Design a protein around this nucleic acid. Sequence first.
DNA 1: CCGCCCTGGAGAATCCCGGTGCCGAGGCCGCTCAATTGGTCGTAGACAGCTCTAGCAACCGCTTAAACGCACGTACGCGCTGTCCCCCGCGTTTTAACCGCCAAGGGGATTACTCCCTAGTCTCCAGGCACGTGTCAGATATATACATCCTGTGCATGTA
DNA 2: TACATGCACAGGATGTATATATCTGACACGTGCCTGGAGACTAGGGAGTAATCCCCTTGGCGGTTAAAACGCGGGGGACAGCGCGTACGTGCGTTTAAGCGGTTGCTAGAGCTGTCTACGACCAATTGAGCGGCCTCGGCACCGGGATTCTCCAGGGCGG
Lengths: 94, 92, 88, 82, 98, 98, 781, 110, 110
Amino acid sequence: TRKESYAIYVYKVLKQVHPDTGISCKAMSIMNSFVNDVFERIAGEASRLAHYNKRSTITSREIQTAVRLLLPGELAKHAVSEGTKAVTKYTSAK
Amino acid sequence: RKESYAIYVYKVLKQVHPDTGISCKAMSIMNSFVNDVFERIAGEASRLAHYNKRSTITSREIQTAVRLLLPGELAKHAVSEGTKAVTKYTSA
Amino acid sequence: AKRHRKVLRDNIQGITKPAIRRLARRGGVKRISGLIYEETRGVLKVFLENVIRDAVTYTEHAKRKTVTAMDVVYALKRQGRTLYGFGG
Amino acid sequence: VLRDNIQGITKPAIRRLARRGGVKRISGLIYEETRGVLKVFLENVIRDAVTYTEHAKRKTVTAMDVVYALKRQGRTLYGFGG
Amino acid sequence: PHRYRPGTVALREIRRYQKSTELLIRKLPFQRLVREIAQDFKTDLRFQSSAVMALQEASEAYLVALFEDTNLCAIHAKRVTIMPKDIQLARRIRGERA
Amino acid sequence: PHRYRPGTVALREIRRYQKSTELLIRKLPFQRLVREIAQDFKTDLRFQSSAVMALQEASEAYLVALFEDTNLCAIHAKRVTIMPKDIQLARRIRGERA
Amino acid sequence: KIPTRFSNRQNKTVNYNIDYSDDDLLESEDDFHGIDIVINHRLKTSLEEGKVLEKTVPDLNNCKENYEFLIKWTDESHLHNTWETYESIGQVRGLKRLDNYCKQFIIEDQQVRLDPYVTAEDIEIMDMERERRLDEFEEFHVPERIIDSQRASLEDGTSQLQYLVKWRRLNYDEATWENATDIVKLAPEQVKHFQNRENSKILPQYSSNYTSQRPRFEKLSVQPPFIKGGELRDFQLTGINWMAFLWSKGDNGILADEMGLGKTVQTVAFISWLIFARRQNGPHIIVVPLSTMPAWLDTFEKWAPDLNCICYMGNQKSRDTIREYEFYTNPRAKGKKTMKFNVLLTTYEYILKDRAELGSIKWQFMAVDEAHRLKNAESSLYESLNSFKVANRMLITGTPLQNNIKELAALVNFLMPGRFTIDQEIDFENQDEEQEEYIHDLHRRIQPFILRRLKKDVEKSLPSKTERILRVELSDVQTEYYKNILTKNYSALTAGAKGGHFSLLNIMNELKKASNHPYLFDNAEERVLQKFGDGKMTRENVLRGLIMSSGKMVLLDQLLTRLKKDGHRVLIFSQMVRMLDILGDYLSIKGINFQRLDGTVPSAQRRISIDHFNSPDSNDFVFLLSTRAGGLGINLMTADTVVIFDSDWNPQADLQAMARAHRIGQKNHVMVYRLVSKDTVEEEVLERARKKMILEYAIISLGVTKKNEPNAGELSAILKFGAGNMFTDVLNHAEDLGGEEFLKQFEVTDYKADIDWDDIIPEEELKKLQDEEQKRKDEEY
Amino acid sequence: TRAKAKTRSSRAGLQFPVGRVHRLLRKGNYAERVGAGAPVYLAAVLEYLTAEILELAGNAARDNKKTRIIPRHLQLAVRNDEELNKLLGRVTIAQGGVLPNIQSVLLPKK
Amino acid sequence: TRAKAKTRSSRAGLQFPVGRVHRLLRKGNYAERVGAGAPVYLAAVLEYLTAEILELAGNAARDNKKTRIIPRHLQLAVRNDEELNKLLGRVTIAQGGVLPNIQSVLLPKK
DNA sequence: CCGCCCTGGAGAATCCCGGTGCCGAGGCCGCTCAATTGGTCGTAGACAGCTCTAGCAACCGCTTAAACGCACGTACGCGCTGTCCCCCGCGTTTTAACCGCCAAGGGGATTACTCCCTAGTCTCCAGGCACGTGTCAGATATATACATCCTGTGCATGTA
DNA sequence: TACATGCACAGGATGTATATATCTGACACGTGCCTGGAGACTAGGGAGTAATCCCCTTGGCGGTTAAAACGCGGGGGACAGCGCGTACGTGCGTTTAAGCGGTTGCTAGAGCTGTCTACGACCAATTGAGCGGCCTCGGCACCGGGATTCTCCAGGGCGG
């Protein structure tokens, strides 16, 4: 049975930030749990944000507001940057 | 047209205390309480359906969410109330 | 020099000493030291910035400039402090 | 029949946990209180995990039910799936 | 003459304010403080009155709970006077400082 | 005969166990305790080994954080020895007791 | 009755009673002649030892044996004030009051006497407030009213007659029991008035029962004999005839006469006519502002001395004393209590505070002074007064119509609730004949119910008042702030400000602030000082920056120099007190003796400033006001010029602002200069104010107290004037049929300054400013 | 020939609206499908919890000689019952006040 | 011609899967509709947070002379950074240990 | 001559460097399922217009209770000292955790078939939200009857 | 013999209790209506059930060795008592600002109605990215022998 995970994406992000550093199975499982937990928090906050404003759709505005609500301080304002240009780059292509 | 729970809370109050009134602020507090318990039980049942790869929310998920959220004797008495309400609704 | 600044800066001092004393009396405090009040003002300020920042975020998501009571309710819930009596 | 297994959490284990917590001196009445609070904590987590197991119509208690039970109590644990 | 003992007036105030339910902070200084804090996050902010009422109710509830924890800290240290160290201990155990 | 002063060995174990990573409770006594607690809720329960391991990690993290707050309570009361009332105060302020 | 639902949860029963008793704390809880007020001090304690050792300063123990203090004691009557000494007192309660008196009066008076840096103006201001305090305290000795008499038994003194005495400026909680003999001996007229009030022939129980059967009223060509007073004038007697004729028809009215015509005298004489002639001597109520209420009390004391007029103010104890000592003839009964008084004077605050205790009285007449306060039908005062059970009501005002027709509708619905309806506003863009017919219908509908007489129709000696509108261009700083606000520029509005807290809520408020002065904005003086005066701020470029920051200030500076050159005194009215702060600083660095009145000034300093400005030996030249402060009772006889720095939305507020100096008895031609910023939001302020003056001139001025054919033309002409925009030897204090006269003072006179940075502060002023700055460094300070 | 319509609350013997709870479950984004007995069960549980708090608050109002439940009575009822206290542990009731208690060391003497 | 099927992650310049995040948002019962830029923004935020922890954890592995990240390095990186400690304040990392911290009262006096 | 402080040396603990080896980290490959692309279509939300109400800025007036400053007394926090007891360090003996292995058996996870429950749609109808009124209960006014106290006049006495 | 004065008795005015009529606040109820809930029918997919694999978890011996239990001495820390001084409580007099009511125009924002378009859901064909399986070999764990670093106690020297 095919089981999906964020292992290859965490690994290639690690090779970006540290090209000569490895990782273990337990640390990869912890990274997968972290990514799943943060995804669940941001998606739940955006779902509640769309519900409070009587909207049927989740757009990048709700995810941006969820990131500003959940991420503390400067870690928010870089991430708000890192999402935004990505959307802009997506707009440059699709 | 405000979509509140005030009349049903009033009928329940007349069931338990037929000669006791309620203020508007207390009625708003009871409305907020019913909404909070609704969203807690529905969120826990949604998580229970997602954890077991199930596409529907049945009375089993609501029962498990009630005994997960409510503590102690409140949980088992609410399970008794919901079980006999489901039994009465099914038979008739 | 009768003219001066329009804005007021020591609005944290509007949380007066007898108000902090009354709040400690509701908490069951019998004796209060004199250094309590500045610490209490700092704690109140930190709590108020934490709630008000999230409420302003909820306001700006709705493309509004008016902070409603429901935004304050949503903000407190997200900080783990559910408040009844204003949600309806 | 399992009984008196709370004494299996021995006094050196509680001393080691306090050493990891940074405790230099430990009174003799600490260990019974620590056993009691461990029993209360384990009862809460195990009761929620058994509820999650019984909802799934299963007889075994998986680690994922334990992760769910710890999530429900605001005590998120990384490294066992999720 | 007839001066009261130091402590019985405090006990009368405890027994009075634990019975009552009104707000212990004047409304206008709290509105001024909320507007002063809120203008740092965003300029030209309007406020509903019930928003400031809810902020006041939450603030006094938080401070009263913190004062109960602070009093427990002070009693634990063989004292009856609360000190800033009791507030830092209560907020550290609660996880606000941790 | 050689002797250490009372306390430097305790600092040595504090430095040792704050650097270490492994579980500080033995596996079989914790597994037996988990099974005894679990048979009160449902009879004839089986357990994955990873379930018992996750319970052990959560339990030791809970107890280590509780001992940190207990040590803060003991230091606040001008003591270096932790008492059961320090655990009671830490759990009371944390909201677990009352 | 019985609950149909119960709880199966086995919880323990809980006592929810949160009521507490402090009885166990009674172990630490329980188990009137003292010092109240210290009035005056004397430098000789017992005898004059000598004039030596008059230097240095005394200490507290030195003053303990050198001075004797006048003491009013606790629960006394300001007649048993004793000259005492610290050793003569011993240890009584209130010694801290004596210590505080001795401390602040003696040490502050001796340091202001012995300082070298004390001018003559400060010492005469301190002397006049010193004697003002002594005259206010000496007023308390005189009785004002005797409430009740009793027979009290003293310590083996058999029976003594004891009078309950109220004092002049004191209230009913200072009413005291006093001996009869000295009270008769010092003021027997009040005693005689008390026995006249005792077996009086006019009571509410002796009132007639006119129920739609009131007798016909004949016109009185002479003053009636029961109104003693002074002498009623002809227009006042005509007003008496009008109010009596309206009462005989069973109708209510508005006495809309202008201020200074004596409306108080007219309604007091009408109350006297209602009591004496028609025998309607029951409970009447007059609701007045608190500031004008002494002017009602002495009017009742002078013109109607036989009446039982009572005063209803004060705290809970004083009003309780009035309630259970003076309302009822039989206050100790329990059934129907008949009323004892004739007239009750009260204020709006105690109408709202005591509507339960005063609404349950069958009032026979009601008179509401300053009824423009009743212009809002949704106000709490309107709901409180409209719920009263009153037969006949009357509104006394000067401006029945202020902003829109809805206020006049509220007034006539307060008077006659239902027979008049107003549902259509007045639109100047239509200008049709149907609106003119509606206006003439409103003319003919409220014509007999409103009596308005004008200060120009009577008293043929009043000098004319001329209003000149001066429109000045904006400065560069005002123009750039106006552009930054109007085209919102938060980054540019912040600029060099460290805080950057600029509030752009209420755009029109900020536009009016920019039209007035740039210095109203935060961190705005620093940019002007560092951009042109290069930041030195050495006492001479500050005034220049003040003058050329705003375009109104150059016109104000030229006007003040020209009026100082002539023999004129000037008032300046502003809508904001921060603008008054800017002008006060301008006249402080400018060096002009000014006085100021706004809402922050308490009433004692207000009366001090008004008396100082109106003194014949006054060095004051300029008197600044916030426009909506002080009420209608400020007397500004000596001033001649009025400058409206800031126009009001309500033109009646500017009308009372002009009428502070344009009162009855003004000896000089009043000149009004209105300062207007060009191409700004103040132009539509004046447009709305002009439209409101057109509306007030239509309904009220053409329905006061072959021309009907020309009315259909001149209403169309005034609607064409109201439908047109007014904005398309200057400063002379001189001026060389009524329809064309209203076309005056709506013209706009443009003023061009063209004064650059290097003209003002001339060689006379620059030499005086530089020598004062150089001499200040020599004397340091 | 449609039959006489009766509410789903009356079928289950409830006072709380089963149809409104079903509509809020369907539109609340909880699952793709909602079972038939789930709104009945949830309405019964909500009605029971409302009955418990309203009965305890009516007792609190009766003990303080009042005929209307105010927020103070709700706060006293919730905080005096430990199961309802820990159900609403992180919940602040507006205009509710606190439980009146003083610590024993702050008392003056015996 | 199907234009070689360029993925959305390469279009957004990301290493996290935009398509998998879109499928998890659609199947996660969050809203009826999901916008096009929401998975892009969310995948970018997740990748940024992953890089932020992984760089500090690699630094922690380097400071203890290791070329492989273990859970101890992740715990040291999370607890030593001020904002990741607030993000993961109620989170246990298994086999993570604690920060080495001894209170100064317990230190010996010289 | 006596008390304190530095230091010298003693042995325990831990670091460091080298060797060995082991087992998971990572790379390669087949496959197959989920992302991508292209096209169609319904509708969510943006936009526009109109009406009504709360908020906002800066000012006014009045009341009155709360805040504040100050002085004084005293309760309590803190520092110091003694004492005793309980916890810590260390050696010795026990014991059970841990690793490994045994034997069977049952619980949980893919693939196929079926069936019934719920979404969807249409139609109908009644539950609930506002108005607005007849009626019931509490408070108040009004007329009437009984208990209670102030008061004027006849009887008797003293005096010129 | 007549005038002035002390003492006792009967009828008139007043306060209070009670029956009856009127005003004001609340409560069930008539009416409209409208919108959301209910009844009836259809279809399909989610869920239930069965067969099969297979892997993992639950109950007894054997060694070994490190951890746990236990005893004992002692010394450091908890705790009690006492003294002191200072900071806080408390009362009182004075100021001040909160609270309330009020102006005046404009704008934000909720709510309702109507249009319309871009955008996301949905479906089919395709294909390539990601995942399970397999294999290997280097990063890291274990061990052994010095080197070094580290408190701890006793002895000599120096100052008081």
